[PDB]
């Protein structure tokens, strides 16, 4: 035990189908004339079609209600994989090299091997760093983040 | 001549860690054919100091002084010795000059003044300018020292000659 | 080409007003749609307090530009121009035009906050269009003041960057802002400069082994000439040390490989920096001078 | 030389210190020697003290000390001695 | 402003040009020297005393002997091992015979024959040539790799059945060098290529042209001739396909002699040629007089 | 596990030379991590001294 | 999401792999008409197939 | 000027054969010449293309050529479009790379793609229609790139050392698919190359002052990251190559000058222009449109 506790934190995803219930003319809608524009090119010609509608709320209150009726499946794998934080804060190292190397291979994380116009695009403004699975079998993985 | 210039120029930038000094040479009908001369690819050069010894292998002797096995399996000493062995070799820089000329004219066309003792001419039907690097380690060198120049060409062939420091610097060593 | 933009927040009359004095703008969008919404007009999007010049610029390289037509009630009609022919733009720049100009689009160095519109924490800025001679000395003045940023402590440095930020253009003078904050620099101004100093260190260490490799093959007076420069700028840097340099010749491959790659990658972050964008030609400046026509270069 | 490749604590008036340790420079006449060898012992000193970290003095309008770095103190009135014999 | 070392190094030109021989005076060649070079500016000495020349010479002495010691090798090996098996030699190349012959004459045009092939046999000879292609790097592992094949144990029901192909052996025609005497007008062909392949209705060899065709010096009394193999067995055949056979020893001689005389050369990247290996190469970029040059 | 003995004690389970092979035919990890795994050096010396 | 959870069953040439892959029992003296349970889980080429 | 350039096809034509043409439709054509009327044999990159000959050679040529799209195959007969500059136009993409909306295109002659079974567009006899490839810019600039560096660090090497780096060189991987360069070969073009990339780096060399210089320097001793560590990795192991010198620490600036520094820098700034021109391929299309299936773009022309 090392000496203190941490609490994980956990998001999940479901995939849910919704209800409303809306009052009789609750609102108000103005529709105007279409506009067709067009774009020519050498070999075909493409039109665009553009509708204006206006939409007003008549209600004194809330005329609309919404309820969650029915859930069927979880996106993501509720699993307990810890977040990765050198992906967060990939700038980060120990300013004594050996030490740095030492802690990296002990936690498992590999260093950038070479430096690249990726790498650096990585470094400075970021990028999606962690690849996906070979295979995925339970879903999203939802990352745990400790406290 | 430009390579003349050139390889003084990088031998001097050199000279601290090599210890060699530039030899400059031009070559003719006297040392290799037309033919030769038009389709040469490389010069290379080799320094053997007075006991026989070839300056890229170790001072104190190295496994090759073993005498040879005649196993197939082992060659002679295969991969190790040859990368020891090519270790050796040095390579040249050089041009190829593939029309008849006469020198001293040729060096006048250039920028260069000449002054010689004797001004004769010398005529030849093609010229390969080369500079090879004289080895001098202690700031001193031996009359005993021995160089080797290789021409190689495109089909891998080879001709080789030797040359010892006497007859290359005995007059230009004692006016200096 | 016609591009509709549309706004869901809630304009006044006022706000119309504000926005009708920028007809003939230079809006730039991300990227080119029939139907945008009015938070992707203009830089607005981009900025962050961590990022700063050079980002914006690599930015503003790869979006597209449009013109601006006059209102509807509720809606901005966009164009986008065609090479080649000519267009009436407006002055948002600092500094006054005139006939033959090349003109560069800029990120703004500062505004003035005069006629912002803002609408609920969104508000439209848009870019300098500025001649090239600013921008290449604002640019490169910018540059060079990111590496003198490292050791201000002395005097004569202050004093350096003092005139430095200071620039006059026919006739208008004003201050740049100055790239390090708190002590600081910005992490894409401190990439481009750690670039262009790796760029230089590793030119100077590898140049005499490339000049070796290609004399080899050919030995022309313009590599004599090469050789040469290289020695007296070894023996000048080396005024200092004992002894010799000592540049080795058996370097392993791996290390050549990954020294060239190095240099080549370093090469790429600049390619931002070391050119201007340059899209417009004007032709004709009325006498007020707030707007221009110009011939269309993009 | 020696200066420059140390590893300090803080680089910053190390540099400064090396830097006059690089201007020094004697004149043609001797009457100027003095001042110029104390201005060049005393960042000499600093610099040697700030190698093995002692506390350096700070006061105001306050200067460094010209003395002998880790030499036994026997020693020390030895050099001293041969100095006096000197003058 | 300041003058570039282009400038001083030709106006102050040259003053030397001097010829010189290599050691054996074979080639002659022409040495420049500039009063410009750094050579000058050097502190250099120099000396020549007697018992370092002396010893250079001993060791060039040495460096030439590496041929001529290995020929005299394989010519005491020839007298040794036909004075172990007594003059009684078998037949080992395939040519037919009459009992009729009068053999004695063509043991003595054997005797002549060797006295001549030791009178001119030189640095082109089959031997040479034959051991050249052992120095090669991948020699090695390519002997490892064919002792490993040779040796393996024969292969079990399971992989004759299923897997890969069967791993193929050595092929029958081999290419060896042969050195070619001929006694009725002094004639000696060093350093010859031929192809030799073991004849089917029995077991021995057959020697042909590169090109195909039978060669036919077995039938010829005047003429012997000496074969080395790859695997540095030789064959000393006088006509009728009687052959001595040993093997070409070189324990007599260091590996640093023999590797650093002729090892083979091996080209590094140029001009016109592909980056990847084994490629066809191009045209050779030669540069001559009979045209303009391309710049 | 006495009725398992069918399978247990046949020649298969106890020959690894198989498994040798295909270990020498994937060849030695290139990841820098295994690296450190892989430097492990055994030498024969004679014990007279 | 561990490594694995038999080493001797899930490697690429582990015991149990040459023991019921089809493609070493090839190689080993096997009787192709007997049926074996395992085999569908370590025929990795037709899985991957 | 010739807008609308007539083709012949000097080879009777089968239905599957204009089945074929009426499908590439839009294609993007090679043209040695801006002629009135060609015949087939002058199509796309066949004349030109030459194993034992190289990459660069046929990437010259084709960069010379001009640049035409079909349509109209009406019987032994078909019609190519020569683009003028600013206008949109639709664009069939033959390659295997994957287009995305906003970048830039370059063309250049086709790389070797993974599955090697390439198949045959027409084949009329001994000849067939090869189209160039029209490649994303950080794509064709990465190729660029890396041929420069494989000449570079090939020359006075032997084939055993340069066997691994090169087969490690040639390998692209561009947007989840793997490309390799096919015929790299040391030309006088390559080699024209190298010397003005050597002149380039010399005078970047001798141009740069003492403060661009010591940047690095000064972040390392004032800073630490992932990326600085990166860079101080090759300059330690060059200083360590070089000598047992421990890193020197820099001095104070002895000569500071506004101008010197604007004047330097802008010397600086042509001379790695110059270095860029290597690399950089001419941008022939802006994308901004694309098909989701990935075979057709709408694109603006640029010259």
Sequence with gaps: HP??????????????????????????????????????????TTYHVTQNINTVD???????????????????????????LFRVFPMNVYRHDEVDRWIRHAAGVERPQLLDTETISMLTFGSMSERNAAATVHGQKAACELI | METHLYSDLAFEARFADDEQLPLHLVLDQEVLSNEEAETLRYVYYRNVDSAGRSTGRAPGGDEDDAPASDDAEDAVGGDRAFDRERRTWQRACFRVLPRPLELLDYLRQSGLTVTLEKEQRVRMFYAVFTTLGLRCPDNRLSGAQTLHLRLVWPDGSYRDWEFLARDLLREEMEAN | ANIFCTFDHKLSIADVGKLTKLVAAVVPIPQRLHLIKHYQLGLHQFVDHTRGYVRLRGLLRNMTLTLMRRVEGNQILLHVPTHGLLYTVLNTGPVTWEKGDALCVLPPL???????????????????????????????????????????????????????????FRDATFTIPDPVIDQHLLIDMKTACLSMSMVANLASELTMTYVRKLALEDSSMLLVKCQELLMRLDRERSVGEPRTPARPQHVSPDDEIARLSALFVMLRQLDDLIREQVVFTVCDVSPDNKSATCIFKG | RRG???????????????????????????????????????????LAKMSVRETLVTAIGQTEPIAFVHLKDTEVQRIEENLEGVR | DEVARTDEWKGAGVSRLREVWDVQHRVRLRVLWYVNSFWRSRELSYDDHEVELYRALDAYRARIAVEY??????????????????????????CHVSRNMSWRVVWELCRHALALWMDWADV?????????????????????????????????????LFGPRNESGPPAEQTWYADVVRCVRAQVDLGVEVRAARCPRTGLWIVRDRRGRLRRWLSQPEVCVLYVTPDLDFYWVLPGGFAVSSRVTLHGLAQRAL?????????VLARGMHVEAGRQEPETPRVSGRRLPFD | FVDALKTLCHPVLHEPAPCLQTFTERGPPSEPA??????????????GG | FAATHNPWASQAGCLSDVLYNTRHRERLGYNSKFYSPCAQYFNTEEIIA
């Design chain 5, 259 to 267: 590797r650093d005389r002729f090892q083979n050369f091996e080209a």
């Design chain 6, 34 to 47: 295994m690296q450190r795994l892989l430097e492990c050096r055994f030498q024969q010396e004679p014990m």
């Design chain 1, 58 to 84: 008549m209600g004194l209150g809330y005329t609309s209600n919404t309820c969650v009726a029915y859930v069927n499946r979880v996106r993501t794998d509720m699993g307990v994989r810890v977040q990765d």
């Design chain 4, 4 to 46: 420059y490749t140390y590893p300090f604590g803080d680089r910053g008036k190390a540099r400064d210190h090396l830097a006059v340790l690089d201007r020094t420079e004697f004149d043609t006449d001797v009457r100027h020697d003095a001042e110029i060898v104390e201005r060049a012992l005393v960042s000499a000193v600093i």
């Design chain 3, 110 to 168: 500062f505004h003035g906050r005069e006629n912002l519109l803002t609408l609920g924490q969104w508000e439209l800025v848009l870019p300098w269009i500025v001649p090239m001679p600013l921008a290449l000395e604002i640019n490169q003045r910018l540059l060079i003041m990111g590496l003198f940023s490292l050791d201000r402590s002395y005097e004569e440095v202050k004093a350096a960057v003092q005139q430095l930020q200071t620039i006059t």
């Design chain 5, 69 to 94: 010691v290995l020929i005299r090798a394989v010519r005491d090996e020839i007298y040794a091992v036909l004075r172990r098996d007594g003059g009684a030699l078998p037949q080992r190349f395939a």
């Design chain 5, 124 to 160: 082109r000879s089959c031997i040479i040539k034959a051991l050249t292609p052992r120095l090669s790097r991948g020699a090695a592992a390519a002997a490892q790799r064919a002792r490993r094949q040779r040796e393996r144990s024969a292969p079990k029901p399971q992989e004759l």
């Design chain 1, 3 to 44: 000496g203190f506790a941490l609490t994980a934190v956990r998001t999940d995803t479901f995939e849910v189908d919704m209800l409303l219930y809306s009052g009789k003319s609750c609102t108000s809608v103005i529709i105007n004339n279409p506009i067709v524009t067009k774009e020519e090119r050498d070999i075909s």
